[PDB]
Design a protein around this nucleic acid. Structure first.
Lengths: 123, 190, 147, 340, 303, 125
RNA sequence: AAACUUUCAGCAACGGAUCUCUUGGCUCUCGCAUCGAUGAAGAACGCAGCGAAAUGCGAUACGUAAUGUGAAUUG
RNA sequence: UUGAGAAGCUCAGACGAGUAGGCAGGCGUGGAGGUUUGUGACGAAGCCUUGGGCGUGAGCCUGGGUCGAACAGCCUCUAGUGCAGAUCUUGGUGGAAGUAGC
RNA sequence: GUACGUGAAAUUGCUGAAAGGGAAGCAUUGGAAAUCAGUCUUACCUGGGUGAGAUCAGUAGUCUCUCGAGACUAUGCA
């Protein structure tokens, strides 16, 4: 099944572009005076359950394999029977040596490691 | 003694569970599918059968109720033959009259363990680059000592210091072609 | 010291700087953005005319109540003035701008002012930081004929 | 310490280095040399076997000879010459002496056995390509073969001997028979053939037919030092991954009753044969060692960093010099220092 | 002092005395030197500023300019002889690349080929290895063989081998700049460029530097007045290709000092590994390996 | 674990009584391990450090440099050994502080006090 | 068009948040009973080799005696 | 036919603004017990980013740079646990302006 | 570099690229410039011949478990 997104532009809290105190993460407005709350046309949209994505092609990367944080060499082993539905995303704090051994074994399991190239310059 | 050990470990806390976001995974070494399902967890399911390699040759591990209280002797073992059609015919003759769900798993984890050895052997025989680690302490030292050693050579100045010395010594014919007509006479004056 | 300019190579360039200079910040800037991009020895003949009221420096950005002069039209700017304290400080710097190539052994008669910077300072007034870049004009060799 | 040297351009460097001499240190004394020999590339040195005091330095053009170092400076005692046909296709990979005999084995199985003083030579033919051969030092007249895809096999002139044999009987082509041929280890952990490339053979029987159960250990280009036996069978009795760079030199340290090895990357490290593990490494070397000779409580490592160290049984660096050229083999003459 | 306010007032007053008597040391020195410029001399002959090049570690393999025979007996008969002897072999370069290289690795692989005539470009396709390339490239009249080895769309390393058995060198490119990025660049021409190589005091310095003489044509055209530099300085091999024009400059004592205009590229190498023999990263014998822990001393140099 | 209500396990109390101990406590906190040749002839695991001992340095960047202790600096918790001297820019030499726990004692400066400590504390002369 | 303003990015400034610590606080618990006309608590002044919002001390003054440890102090 | 986390799986219809209010499921922060044969000087936390990824969203995962000693996921316990606003408290910095003015 | 661990935001100056006819700000759909990612690198699968052996031997032994189940050491590699 080809992956699809009902929306691609994230939601952006109202007037979080003008003021630097107001952050961009979404916060539903609380006043009935609001133009946005009454949903006047022309104002920005809102997070609703309508924009929920397909319950089967959810959590999937655009390739089709879902992600999976592998933080050591025995976390990629579980992905042995799931190499065509999961991509072994290595965690960020893993050292640049313990990383180069996950790659050499995930490659045997045919698992896509998404960022195997970090800290690893090849010769 | 089975739903007891699934309503404890399957729903409250099990040390092997991994909270994924679309699934949950089991870190047990005797799981046949990798997931923490009811019909998959090796702790609740008290008659089980898994396939897992050990140093080149794939094995089959089986347990029963009547050995459950003996954790050392709990799992027996059968070594699976190299011929892939022989191994399927050897799983069945050992796993007879077991449910069709369980024997389905073992044959699927035989297809999945053979593809791992048939790949990691070809992968080991190819010649592939060396993943060598970068090191922040020794790439911030280079960048530090580079610009301290780049400006400490007067790179452009030492080029021209000998470039005229290469001219003034006369490695080119007396009147060369890379020089204009006037300043060569200064070299004649030199 | 780590400077703000990509130029000022070891090859044909030299730098000086001046920190915590007890002058105004909105007054040395308009001087600084006038002397910028000019040759070195001309800037000396330029600024001494400011010291004798022979030339005024335009006030482009911080043009608060600056009366019009007759000589501000040499650059097209309406308003200009003759600050004397700020240009006294720049002369001190540009001496070090010379005397650093005089120790590096450059060519002095192809020397332009490449990058002059004026910043603020930790308030005690409105003090200033200044760093200057003087560089040779990066000449061009004629191309060899054909191939 | 008295120790003789010879580089790839033929000349002989004769060193009087002593303890505490670090040529990198300005506050150390300078090396004392008496250099001679041919300065051309064609007479370049390959090996320096040590006859009891006479060095027998061979050359790439086949000018194997006899150098006595008792005289100061050494003067050539005698000289041999080999035919150019054995230089055309073959190349010299070994030279070892035991009981008045001198091999000059080549890279195709040609075994030129030359006598020392009687000068009666015997040539032999063997199996595929060679990379190392060796003589049993205790029992006279036992050879070990070895090369790439030519696993170790024990051709022996006299299989019995029982103490010793008269010299002129030795190494007749009629009596040399293989009394041992190696059998490979099993397949790898992925069912792949363990490819065999023997690079050096040393006889370990000191530190572990009358006098059977021959014991020896060999190294491989693929990086796996393997011990051997005959009473136990034709498989190696032990296999270790002592390193991963191709192992270049193996030998004994007879004062520790222990066996060392080396490689291309200079992981020259002693190896416990009793506890089956590497115990210590010779530190400070940065570059491929070309040859290593050991004598008593000292060793000498000459490397492609153009240096000659003096380590000991306890791998403590004694002396460290520079030699102005690319060396090829080192021989130790005097264990004592310069003042003795 | 555990206080912070006291600690930077006690130091402000301590510095303002150390910043005072230094002037009091130099003010009294200021009056006697213009009476007697001879004491000015001694000091100047005494207190020359000390710099890293003058405070090196004493390495005994610094070859002096005095010609000793054992040097020239070696390197007149090595494998670099054909590019140094009377034969004067024009070296034909082969520049391959790392497998599955990208676009940003290929626009740099045209800038080096601007530097090198008698140099082809052959992009590495599919499954082939460097040791099999060298033997397959020597049979078609090639001399050396460069390999640009990018990673993640930046070029980081460069290895050149010497055929068919010569020493193989593994540098790493750093501080990479193209020809477009440099301010006041120039066009290159078809003229074969000229060479300069500086500060290779070590013996290993005169092993790499000959393998850098080995890539350039042994007698260049002078009409282009193009110069290529390999300047070792603190074990970094600076590469700068310039085009010069001689013009009068009064400061330097001869009066005639040229003016350079860079062409590109602008890269800078370290030296990591050197292997006699074709470069196999695992099946090779190491002539020199870079110790990343014995280069901590900024006064220790190996090039 | 510790089973006394008259010893303290808090980092606060232990790390204060260390850094603010007087210069008699600051002596037995600066002790050095004896060499393996002295550990069997005095039967003492460790001695407090005196001046003019005969030590070797095991850890640190000054590995293996032997000497004698010049000035046992009880304040900043470090020994000061002979001729192991980091340079200074001006031209003078500076002393390098080697921790008193890193050195290995090879020859004691035996006195009447030390002997009367040696002969009772598990050993003899 | 340049300038000026605005916007983006890089760099330099400003500024001291975040993170990490912690000879400090706060809280609970346990043992103990001990100031003064034989001059207390407090105050002033002095005393250091070089001391300056601090410490110790009393003209025997950054303390003596007695015991114990055992060779330092430090800029 | 294996789709038994029966707290799962599966089939079919209708429905979808929402104030006071009512109900439910989750996200995040500091500490506590258990757990990950957990991550870390080959660089933990933080920070910045014209990089990529997920979730409807609160949020999370990650590449690059910076940096230098600690830190996180899961199940529970616990609260000094979430800010745009209070002529809000403290600190820092702007436009007014080099104007008012001495 | 004592204006000293990390060094956020406001805010200031320079440089680069843009935009600006008495309003910007944001949302939606796309153009132009810049730039980024995608495994596509290669892998896959199918006969004969040659060699290697092991779970093969009309084969001999050891140990731990439970007749045989694994781990082995030989020897052949039918």
């Amino acid at each position: 099944v080809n992956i699809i997104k009902k929306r691609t532009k994230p939601f952006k809290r109202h007037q979080s572009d003008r003021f630097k105190r107001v952050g961009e993460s979404w916060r539903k407005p609380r006043g009935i005076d609001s133009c946005v709350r009454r949903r006047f046309r022309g104002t920005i949209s809102m997070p609703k359950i309508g924009y929920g994505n397909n319950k089967k092609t959810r959590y999937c990367m655009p390739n089709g394999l879902k992600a999976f944080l592998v933080r050591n060499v025995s976390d990629v082993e579980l992905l042995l029977m799931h190499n065509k539905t999961y991509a072994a995303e290595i965690a960020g704090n893993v050292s640049a040596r313990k990383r180069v051994e996950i790659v050499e074994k995930a490659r045997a399991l045919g698992v896509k490691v998404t960022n195997a190239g970090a800290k690893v310059r090849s010769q | 003694q089975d739903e007891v050990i699934w309503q404890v470990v399957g729903h409250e806390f099990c040390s092997y569970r991994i909270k994924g976001e679309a699934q949950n995974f089991c870190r047990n070494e005797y799981n046949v599918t990798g997931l923490c399902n009811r019909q998959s967890c090796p702790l609740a399911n008290s008659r089980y059968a898994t396939v897992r390699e050990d140093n080149g040759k794939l094995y089959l591990y089986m347990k029963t109720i009547e050995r459950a209280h003996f954790p050392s002797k709990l799992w027996q073992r059968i070594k699976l033959s190299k011929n892939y059609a022989k191994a399927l015919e050897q799983i069945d003759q050992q796993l007879l009259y077991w449910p069709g769900r369980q024997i389905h798993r073992c044959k699927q984890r035989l297809t999945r363990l053979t593809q791992y050895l048939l790949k990691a052997r070809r992968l080991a025989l190819k010649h592939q680059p060396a993943l060598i680690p970068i090191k922040p302490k020794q790439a911030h030292r280079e960048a530090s000592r580079e610009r301290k050693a780049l400006i400490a050579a007067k790179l452009e100045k030492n080029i021209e210091k000998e470039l005229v010395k290469r001219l003034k010594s006369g490695v080119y014919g007396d009147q060369p072609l890379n020089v204009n007509e006037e300043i060569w006479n200064k070299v004649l004056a030199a | 010291v780590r400077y703000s300019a990509s130029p000022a190579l070891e090859t044909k360039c030299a730098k000086a700087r001046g920190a915590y200079l007890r002058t105004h910040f909105k007054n040395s800037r308009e001087v600084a953005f006038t002397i910028n991009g000019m040759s070195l020895k001309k800037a000396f003949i330029f600024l001494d005319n400011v010291k004798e009221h022979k030339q005024a420096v335009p006030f482009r950005r911080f043009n608060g109540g600056v009366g019009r002069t007759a000589q501000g039209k040499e650059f097209g700017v309406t308003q200009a003035r003759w600050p004397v304290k700020s240009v006294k400080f720049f002369y001190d710097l540009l001496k070090n701008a010379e005397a650093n190539a005089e120790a590096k052994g450059l060519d002095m008669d192809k020397l332009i002012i490449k990058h002059v910077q004026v910043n603020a300072a930790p308030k005690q007034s409105s003090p200033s930081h200044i760093e200057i870049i003087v560089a040779e004009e990066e000449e061009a060799v004629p191309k060899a004929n054909d191939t | 310490m008295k120790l003789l040297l010879g580089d790839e351009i033929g000349q002989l460097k004769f060193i009087e280095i002593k303890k505490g001499t670090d040529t990198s240190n300005p506050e150390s004394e300078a090396p004392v040399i008496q250099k001679f020999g041919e300065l051309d590339r064609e007479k370049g040195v390959l090996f320096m076997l040590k006859h009891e005091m006479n060095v027998f330095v061979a050359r790439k053009n086949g000018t194997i000879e006899c150098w006595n170092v008792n005289q100061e400076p050494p003067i050539l005692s005698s000289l041999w010459q080999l035919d150019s046909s054995l230089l055309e296709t073959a190349s010299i990979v070994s030279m070892k002496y035991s009981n008045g005999w001198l091999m000059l084995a080549l890279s195709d199985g040609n075994l030129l056995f030359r006598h020392i003083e009687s000068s009666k030579l015997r040539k032999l033919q063997l199996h595929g390509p060679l990379s190392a051969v060796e003589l049993h030092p205790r029992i006279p007249g036992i050879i070990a073969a070895g090369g790439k895809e030519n696993d170790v096999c024990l051709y022996s002139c006299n299989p019995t001997c029982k103490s010793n044999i008269d010299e002129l009987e030795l190494w007749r082509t009629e009596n040399v028979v293989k009394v041992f041929q190696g059998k490979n280890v099993k397949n790898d952990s992925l069912n792949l053939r363990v490819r065999v490339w023997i690079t050096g053979i040393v006889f370990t029987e000191d530190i572990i037919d009358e006098s059977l159960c021959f014991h020896f250990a060999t190294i491989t280009h693929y990086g796996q030092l393997r011990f051997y036996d005959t009473k136990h069978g034709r498989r190696p009795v032990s296999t270790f991954d002592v390193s991963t760079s191709p192992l270049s030199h193996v030998g004994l340290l007879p004062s520790i009753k222990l066996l060392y090895f080396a490689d291309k990357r200079a992981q020259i490290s002693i190896f416990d044969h009793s506890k089956k593990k590497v115990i210590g490494r010779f530190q400070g070397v940065k570059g491929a060692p070309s040859s290593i000779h050991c004598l008593g409580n000292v060793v000498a490592i000459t490397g492609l960093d153009r240096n000659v160290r003096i380590f000991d049984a306890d791998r403590k660096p004694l002396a460290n010099a520079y030699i102005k050229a690319l060396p090829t083999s080192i021989i130790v003459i005097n264990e004592r220092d310069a003042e003795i | 002092i555990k206080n912070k306010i006291v600690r930077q007032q006690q130091y402000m007053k301590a510095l303002h005395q150390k910043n005072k008597d230094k002037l009091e040391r130099r003010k009294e020195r200021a009056k006697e030197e213009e009476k007697d410029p001879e004491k000015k001399r001694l000091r100047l002959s005494e207190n020359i500023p000390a710099t890293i090049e003058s405070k090196r570690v004493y390495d005994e393999t610094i070859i002096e300019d005095k010609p000793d025979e054992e040097l020239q007996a070696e390197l007149k008969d090595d494998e670099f002889s054909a590019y140094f002897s009377e034969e004067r072999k024009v070296p034909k370069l082969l520049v391959t690349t790392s497998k599955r290289a990208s676009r940003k690795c290929y626009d740099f692989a045209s800038e080096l080929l601007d530097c090198f005539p008698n140099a082809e470009f052959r992009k590495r396709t599919g499954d082939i290895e460097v040791h099999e390339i060298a033997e397959a490239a020597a049979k078609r009249g090639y001399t050396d063989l460069l390999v640009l080895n990018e990673d993640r769309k930046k070029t980081n390393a460069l290895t050149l081998v010497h055929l068919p058995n010569g020493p193989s060198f593994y540098f790493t490119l750093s501080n990479l700049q193209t020809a477009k990025e440099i301010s006041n660049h120039g066009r290159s021409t078809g003229h074969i460029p000229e060479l300069i190589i500086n500060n290779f005091s070590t013996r290993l310095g005169m092993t790499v530097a000959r393998a850098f003489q080995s890539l350039f044509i042994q007698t260049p055209q002078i009409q282009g007045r193009q110069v290529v530099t390999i300047h070792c300085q603190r074990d970094f091999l600076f590469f700068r290709r310039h085009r010069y024009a001689f013009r009068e400059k009064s400061n330097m004592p001869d009066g005639i000092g040229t003016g350079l205009q860079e062409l590109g590229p602008r890269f800078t190498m370290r030296l990591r590994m050197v292997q006699k023999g074709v470069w196999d990263r695992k099946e090779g014998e190491v002539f020199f390996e870079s110790n990343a822990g014995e280069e901590s001393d900024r006064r220790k140099f190996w090039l | 674990m510790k089973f006394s209500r008259d010893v303290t396990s808090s980092r606060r109390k232990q790390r204060k009584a260390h850094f603010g101990a007087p210069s008699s406590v600051r002596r037995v906190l600066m002790s050095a391990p004896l060499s393996k040749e002295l550990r069997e002839q005095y039967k003492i695991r460790s001695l407090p450090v005196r001046r003019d001992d005969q030590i070797t340095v095991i850890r640190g960047s000054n590995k293996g440099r032997e000497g004698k202790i010049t000035s046992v600096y009880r304040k900043k918790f470090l020994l000061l050994i002979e001729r192991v001297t980091r340079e200074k820019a001006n031209g003078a030499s500076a002393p390098v502080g080697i921790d008193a726990s890193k050195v290995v004692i090879t020859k004691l400066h035996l006195d009447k006090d030390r002997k009367d400590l040696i002969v009772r504390k598990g050993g003899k002369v």
